[PDB]
Ligand binder design. Structure first.
Ligand SMILES: *[B]([O])([O])C1=[C][C]=[C]C([N])=[C]1
Length: 358
């Protein structure tokens, strides 16, 4: 890499790893469209396996960006509309509180208080139906945002129903394959296990547990190379040859709702660039990010704004991920770690790197 990118990344990430006791980390910077890669530490402490550019990390909720783009692609295919009622795709959802709750509300966490987590107790398809039928909204639809797996997870499951494909097959064929993300997985195959890092939580090696709507809300694993490619694809969707995918990526960066200075996309979240770094840094802390906040509808949604900081944090029990990019500057970053360390530290490091390069 150019020495500037080298120095800027190492000066930022080295102290981060030290302060946060991160066992292993991979970083990609996309600069003028090209990726530059950096790795540190251990994918597996016990077996002394280093982090490489081929190490798989759990993306946790950065998976929501793939779900949002897959949904956008389904809209572009004419398979679903965000204006469709949820019941159009799940007619068994007959309880009256669902009247007026559309796919847009599910995709954007604005259905009226669907919870962060699907209860552990919910396994089966019928457990799931039961859960949503019994769920009681605290708020009218389209009035409050509450970040929630049970919201965007259901959006992803419903979005692929007209295709007839499983969520995983739709994701593989319509997003991973066309983008050449050939080392990105909802279920890690046995052949790729050698590359699957352990996560570390309180010093114990852990991997994400199965759960309902896991694939759709937080279940993607990927490498630093495929994630750089994901960022490049979202930075420059016009280079993408598959028309509906290009369009889906654009739709996922449309601005649907505003709360404070952030705008809710499909999976992606966006702020105007130049950002106030305290705003994105403090904003990423779960004290704010997981809070219930009133929203203003953007009527109609603003199409993808090039001058945006577009980003998403993700975590599982053992992993902490972050992706951010600025379309107008052809600039982006991916930070993958196998410890779930605090969000504000991620965003601070990212902003320090990108601000120094823009
Ligand atoms: B995501 O990483 O923000 C997330 C939120 C809640 C639960 C899970 N598994 C992921």
């Amino acid at each position: 890499a150019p020495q500037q990118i080298n120095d800027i990344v190492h000066r930022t990430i080295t102290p981060l790893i030290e302060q946060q006791k991160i066992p292993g980390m991979a970083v990609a910077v996309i600069y003028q469209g090209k990726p530059y890669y950096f790795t540190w530490g251990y994918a597996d402490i016990a077996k002394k396996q280093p982090v490489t550019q081929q190490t798989l990390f759990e993306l946790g909720s950065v998976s929501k960006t793939f779900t949002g783009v897959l949904g956008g692609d389904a809209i572009a295919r004419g398979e679903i509309k965000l204006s469709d009622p949820t019941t159009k795709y799940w007619p068994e959802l007959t309880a009256k509180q669902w009247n007026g709750i559309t796919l847009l509300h599910l995709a954007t966490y604005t259905a009226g208080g669907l919870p962060l987590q699907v209860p552990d107790e919910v396994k089966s398809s019928s457990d799931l139906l039961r859960f949503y039928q019994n769920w009681q909204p605290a708020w009218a639809p389209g009035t409050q945002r509450l970040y929630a797996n049970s919201s965007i997870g259901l959006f992803g499951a419903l979005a692929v129903k007209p295709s007839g494909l499983s969520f995983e097959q739709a994701m593989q064929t319509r997003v991973f394959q066309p983008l050449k993300l050939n080392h990105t997985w909802i279920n890690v195959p046995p052949a790729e296990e050698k590359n699957y890092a352990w996560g570390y939580r309180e010093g114990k090696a852990v991997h994400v547990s199965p759960g309902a709507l896991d694939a759709e809300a937080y279940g993607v694993k990927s490498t630093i190379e495929d994630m750089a490619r994901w960022v490049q694809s979202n930075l420059k969707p016009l280079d993408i040859n598959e028309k509906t995918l290009q369009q889906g990526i654009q739709l996922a960066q449309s601005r649907y709702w505003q709360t404070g200075d952030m705008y809710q996309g499909l999976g992606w979240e966006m702020l105007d660039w130049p950002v106030n770094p305290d705003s994105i840094i403090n904003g990423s802390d779960n004290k704010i990010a997981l809070a219930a906040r009133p929203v203003k509808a953007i009527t109609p949604p603003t199409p993808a704004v090039r001058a945006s900081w577009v980003h998403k944090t993700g975590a599982t029990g053992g992993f902490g991920s972050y992706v951010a990019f600025i379309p107008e500057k052809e600039l982006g970053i991916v930070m993958l770690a196998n410890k779930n360390y605090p969000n504000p530290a991620r965003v601070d490091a990212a902003w320090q790197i990108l601000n120094a390069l823009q």
